[PDB]
C-alpha cells in the first residue's frame, strides 16, 4: 500500500505540473552516456584561457 500510494501521489503531481514521465526520468536518472559531449568541449575550450 505504501508503494501504491507513492505511485498515485507522484503521478498526480506530474499530471498537475504538466511534466511528462520522460522529462522526470531525464531529470532524476543516475545513468549517463559516459562520452564527452560537444557542450562540455566548448565549455572546456572557452574556460582554459
Amino acid at each position: 500500500p505504501r508503494l501504491v500510494i507513492w505511485l498515485y501521489q507522484v503521478t498526480q503531481w506530474l499530471t498537475e505540473a504538466e511534466i511528462t514521465t520522460e522529462a522526470i526520468w531525464l531529470l532524476c536518472t543516475p545513468e549517463f552516456s559516459g562520452n564527452i559531449s560537444p557542450e562540455i568541449s566548448n565549455l572546456l575550450n572557452n574556460l582554459r584561457p
Binding site: 566548448n42 575550450n45 572557452n46 582554459r48 584561457p49
Partner: protein, 49 residues
C-alpha cells in the same frame, strides 16, 4: 621573457568571432597595470674608456 598576456582563443567559434575586441582590451589593461606596478626609476652611471 616569461610574461604572457595574449593567450589566444580570442576568436572563438561559439560566438562566431564576436566579442573579440573585449579580450584584447582586457589583455592590454592587464599589460598596462603590470607595467605601472613594476616600473622603476633607474640609476644613471657614465663611464669613460
Amino acid at each position: 621573457n616569461g610574461v604572457t598576456f595574449i593567450r589566444g582563443g580570442a576568436w572563438n567559434g561559439t560566438t562566431a568571432g564576436l566579442m573579440a575586441g573585449e579580450t584584447l582590451l582586457l589583455n592590454l589593461a592587464e599589460m598596462e597595470k603590470v607595467w605601472l606596478e613594476r616600473d622603476e626609476r633607474a640609476l644613471e652611471v657614465t663611464r669613460t674608456v
